[PDB]
Design a protein around this ligand. Structure first.
Ligand SMILES: O=C(NCc1ccccc1)[C@H](OCc1ccccc1)[C@H](O)[C@@H](O)[C@@H](OCc1ccccc1)C(=O)N[C@H]1c2ccccc2C[C@H]1O
Lengths: 99, 99
């Protein structure tokens, strides 16, 4: 599909059998979701954006379905204000910016 | 132009007769640039990111060229980690997300 940017580009994602709303964020290097439980071991990481850094848990090889497209990649879990789908997963569904 | 996301979507912008590098960010509602001098009066604004909030200076009707496309809009100036072109200007250049 073609998504305009008049409003925040929010989409539904499926992860761990759960449906959630996430923002397609080209400014985010990685994907970060609000606190939740995921399988496997994780590593602590610090990510920085506007406002400073937050501590998140890094999970690798996680499967996520974005708008019907399956994608696998690293997913960070932490105190993010909104669920963010970053470049690491946007590339997997073939998302590009066009103008 | 079609921009893939394997690397940060950085482009050259021209503002105040100077060239700067900025990130095309669909996750940013507004455009925020690193400290710099701009003409006119400014109004205060608080923007929230993943790490918290920061106070920025808001300038209106500012001319900014993005990848050769001329835009005139609101530009925020503050302690942002990188220059960010947000949805307010992405819409002016006709930028969309596709997959
Ligand atoms: O935070 C960002 N990237 C960091 C990141 C790293 C790893 C994983 C996820 C994100 C990105 O920022 C660019 C950046 C790039 C490199 C270093 C620092 C900043 C995110 O896209 C950033 O621009 C975006 O984060 C998503 C978010 C959306 C809504 C509310 C809270 C978080 C963001 O902070 N957007 C806000 C913003 C930005 C500028 C002007 C107004 C507003 C209001 C909100 O929309």
């Amino acid at each position: 599909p073609q998504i305009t940017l008049w409003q925040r580009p929010l989409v539904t994602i499926k992860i761990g059998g759960q449906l959630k709303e996430a923002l397609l964020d080209t400014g985010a290097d990685d994907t970060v979701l609000e606190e939740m439980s995921l399988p496997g071991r994780w590593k602590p990481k610090m990510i920085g954006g506007i406002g400073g850094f937050i501590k998140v848990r890094q999970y690798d090889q996680i499967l996520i379905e974005i708008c019907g497209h399956k994608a696998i990649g690293t997913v960070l879990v932490g105190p993010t204000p909104v669920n963010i789908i970053g470049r690491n997963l946007l590339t997997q569904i073939g998302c590009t910016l066009n103008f």
